[PDB]
Ligand binder design. Structure first.
Ligand code: NDP
Ligand code: NDP
Ligand code: EA0
Ligand code: EA0
Lengths: 522, 528
């Protein structure tokens, strides 16, 4: 077939167009009033250059022998495509420029800028040329025709995670026809998140042996099947940061230790992982399922206030600590003399009054115990190279007084070149229900500390101790692993807020959260 | 020449031989004894030996057929060549060597004196002709000391697949001293345990759908002007190695990442460091004791410090009486005064590790006080949780008592240990807030690895993984030159730690209960 012989790839960038279900079709905005919808997105413009111009001559011979039996790249436009280009660069910095037009003759441009009559008249032009691969730069109509006539092999699709006004749309790529094989890292250019995905059309080596020898010792470990991680295992490149979470699910499903827990439900457990997310480039809110952030933002505001009063949350319908405050739960904890929803000296108490004698959840503790939250802020502002900037919730003395010991042991902060990174160490991690919320919680926290100290957020680093998947979560997580992440949203904090204690729920906005549908983890 | 055409490799296994000791690669030279191998079974070596000498790649032969047929002007199996003593050492049940074309060098023996499917040759020359007239993938020289010596001398070996057996045995025959101009190490395996010995595998080399490979180049359009440009020529050896699979490269490779990508900061003193934030190292304590080999470390001091922790001691005088100076400088009048501890006796280090491990929450008085049944005995508690509730996810030991930080001589570097139990095996995560890669971390790895052994043993479990999480990971700028020397040293197989096994209680350990066996190490380095 033609499209493997000649190497015809599309290359596009689609934004979003003016509750809401998402799918790949979400991204389709191509152009507007003859120009791109967006002002300038220089990373995608840079990606464009690299992909279209790149050449590898050592693999061209293998192309030259197959192509005949039937150096630079070919780039195909349409008139309104060729036109919209600002003058001062045409032809495009050393590529074989080419235009599909009806009312343009090849006379009135160069002899390098080969015009074509119809679509069928391009196969003519290639068999007579010396080029690497063929990139359809597109236009609405150009893409429509080249796709309709199964001419396109791979599709270099840039997903622009922001909404714009559009007069022209990329066609609904048929997912039984084509399918995503690679997803890139997520990036911020020009005040939008984006990523780079790849649709394919469906069907010394001294040291290569040395590799096999070194593997001479390697070991259905768990009852988890091959055919079920199909989409997941059928991607080549999985560089989207959400794969850091998803790959831990995979590792624990594939290689996890079978274990009883206190409940009895059954878990697969491993011990010791890292996740790093770049807060300067995205907000890591998992996209492979709907997540809600009001509760966990209220939880955080509750911590910062020093509250241990489970009821302040329940009245706002944030039920994160409901189970941990019942008579039945406190009694099983031997807390027979503790009022319902008095969670004892937990996070907020420890952050504001570590070392103070806990009484009940209504006492006045002003200026009692160590106000660690205040202390790490001053340190961040006054001593940013300090290696002593820890917020520790694990107070050994008070563990037995807490409804439960802190799942999140400590935050350590690091400062370089006006930038703040944070490590949270988590002793116990429910990968299915908990961890996705936990990533969002401390990322927001990392932003909040960043802002009130006049620093840019850099890296949130999540260290998992006991990392477990509930046996009764495995079906749901199987559905989830075979979803492909969307580009992440962004967090906008109200910039007026300059002390850690002044954030209200209103001061938090999530933007461009494009997500798969909800999953009952049960 | 002749070695590249015919792919003539050597494979051997060498132990240390009967002899304030210095170590080079000539340390590992012992090949056999009284006609046989110096050791009974080392199964993991024997299995490696079989995988390498029987592995062929069907698809790769075609190009080797071409290459070899070109030079002569013209199931798949490997050839294996052995001296007559070598051949006679093999038991009947395993002769001839399975799934391989056996060749034997001999003058005293001819075909008539063998029942078995084997080629006999009396000349090295005759082998090269034999190889010319045969279909094989790779030709491996199984040795005998004499066979090894002459195939080397004749510049015939492309690569030596070399097992370092990190134990000592009576030996009568030795591998030839390899000329380091002739052969350079290009690969070093993971370290392992088999039949009560560590070993690794190193490869010496001689000197003098391709559509989705393009997709890689694309997904890198946005990479590096790489921060601190320190010079290539400096890390020549470190960067030459193709496979760096020795667990010591986990430490070494962090030194490199900090040197090449580290952030420049001036610190607590007004000195100078390079820093990054957030690393993890994993060390399989069932397989080796990860005491670093690219320089000398003594453990006496750090074992004394750990026994001093477990006792709940805060008294620096106890360590100085044992001539352990690890805490001396944090105990001086000058230092306690600069930490505002004006009312603190010299060498009274206040409520640090030991105090927090046995008495967390008790009011610190002075280092002489009897704190019995005051504060939470964390160490006792976690020893009980590991014994009675092994799946508990709360087996943390914590030194970072927020309330007492200002009363300590300095806050703890080593913040906490979380424990994990599966199938009678104990693993340990240790979170380090502040890590001097240069002096501190080598010792810190040694301390918590010994601790995992101690807890594991007194709880009737087997040590599994020690996991080391680094927060602020930094290199002092005056350590840089010393660390360059170190990164160009090739690790040796790790030693082993023996705990006196009669110790059933965490408090009952003493110095003499600790034996490091087979520490093979490079030369002492002053980071200063
Ligand atoms: N999002 C993205 O990735 C990209 C978007 N754009 C945007 O695309 C928009 C323009 O695209 P859309 O309106 O389709 O414009 P096109 O670039 O598809 O141009 C259409 C013209 O191409 C010619 N043509 C198309 N098909 C044929 C054919 N089958 N035979 C002969 N000639 C043919 C005709 O030229 P004639 O006028 O001679 O009839 C036709 O009018 C602009 O807003 C531009 O900014 C451009 C590139 C990429
Ligand atoms: N640790 C390890 O990796 C290895 C250890 N070994 C051990 O080493 C010892 C055996 O080795 P070592 O005694 O050197 O003896 P070899 O196995 O090298 O035997 C040498 C004999 O083979 C013949 N031979 C060698 N070269 C030639 C030649 N060029 N032309 C004709 N014949 C030749 C001669 O046999 P003839 O006497 O018949 O003339 C010679 O006496 C054993 O203990 C064995 O277990 C062996 C291999 C590997
Ligand atoms: C569609 C293409 C090829 N791919 C990506 N990812 N982004 C685009 N903007 N591309 O448009 C085709 C084209 O002709 N682009 C173009 C627009 C403006 C200038 Cl200045 C140069 C090329
Ligand atoms: C030298 C060699 C091949 N390499 C390693 N790494 N370990 C060894 N023991 N080898 O021995 C050569 C040899 O003659 N081996 C041999 C093979 C089978 C038996 Cl049963 C006994 C010895």
């Amino acid at each position: 077939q033609v499209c493997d012989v000649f190497d015809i790839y599309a290359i596009c960038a689609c934004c979003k167009v003016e509750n809401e279900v998402f799918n790949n079709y979400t991204f389709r905005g191509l152009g507007n009033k003859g120009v791109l919808p967006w002002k300038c997105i220089s990373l995608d413009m840079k990606y464009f250059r690299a992909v279209t111009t790149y050449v590898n001559e050592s693999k061209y011979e293998k192309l030259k022998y197959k192509r005949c039996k039937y150096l630079q790249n070919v780039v195909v436009m349409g008139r309104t495509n060729w036109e919209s280009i600002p003058k001062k660069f045409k032809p495009l910095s050393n590529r074989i420029n080419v235009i599909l037009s009806r009312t343009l003759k090849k006379e009135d441009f160069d002899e390098d800028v080969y015009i074509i009559n119809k679509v069928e008249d391009l196969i003519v032009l290639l068999g007579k040329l010396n080029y690497y691969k063929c990139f359809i730069l597109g236009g609405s109509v150009v893409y429509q025709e080249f796709l309709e006539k199964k001419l396109i092999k791979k599709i270099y699709f840039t997903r622009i995670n922001s909404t714009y006004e559009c007069d022209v749309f990329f066609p609904e790529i048929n997912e039984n026809e084509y399918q995503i094989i690679s997803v890139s890292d997520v990036y911020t250019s020009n005040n939008t998140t984006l990523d780079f995905i790849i649709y394919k059309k469906t069907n010394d080596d001294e040291e290569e042996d040395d590799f096999v020898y070194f593997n001479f010792n390697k070991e259905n470990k768990n009852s988890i099947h091959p055919n079920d991680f199909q989409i997941y295992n059928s991607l080549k490149y999985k560089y989207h940061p959400e794969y850091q979470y998803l790959n831990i699910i995979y590792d624990i499903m594939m290689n996890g230790n079978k274990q009883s827990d206190r409940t009895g439900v059954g878990v697969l457990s491993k011990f010791g992982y890292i996740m790093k997310f770049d807060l300067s480039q995205y907000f890591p809110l998992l996209t492979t399922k709907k997540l809600f952030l009001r509760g966990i933002i209220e939880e955080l505001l509750w911590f910062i206030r020093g509250e241990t009063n489970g009821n302040t949350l329940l009245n706002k319908n944030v039920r994160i600590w409901e189970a941990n405050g019942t008579r039945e739960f406190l009694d099983n904890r031997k807390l027979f003399h503790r009022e319902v929803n008095d969670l004892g000296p937990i996070y907020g108490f420890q952050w504001r009054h570590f070392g103070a004698e806990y009484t009940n959840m209504y006492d006045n503790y002003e200026n009692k115990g160590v106000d660690q939250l205040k202390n790490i802020i001053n340190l961040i502002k006054n001593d940013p190279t300090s290696r002593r900037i820890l917020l520790c919730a694990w107070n050994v003395k008070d563990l037995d007084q807490m409804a439960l010991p802190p799942c999140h042991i400590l935050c350590q902060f690091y400062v370089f070149d006006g930038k703040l990174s944070c490590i949270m160490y988590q002793r116990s991690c429910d990968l299915g229900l908990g961890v996705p919320f936990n990533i969002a919680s401390y990322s927001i926290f990392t932003h909040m500390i960043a802002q009130v100290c006049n620093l840019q957020p850099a890296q949130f680093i999540h260290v998992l101790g006991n990392a477990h998947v509930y046996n009764n979560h495995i079906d749901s997580l199987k559905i989830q692993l075979n979803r492909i992440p969307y580009p992440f949203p962004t967090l906008k904090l109200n910039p007026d807020i300059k002390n850690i204690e002044d954030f209200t729920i209103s001061d938090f906005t999530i933007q461009n959260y494009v997500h798969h549908e909800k999953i009952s983890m049960d």
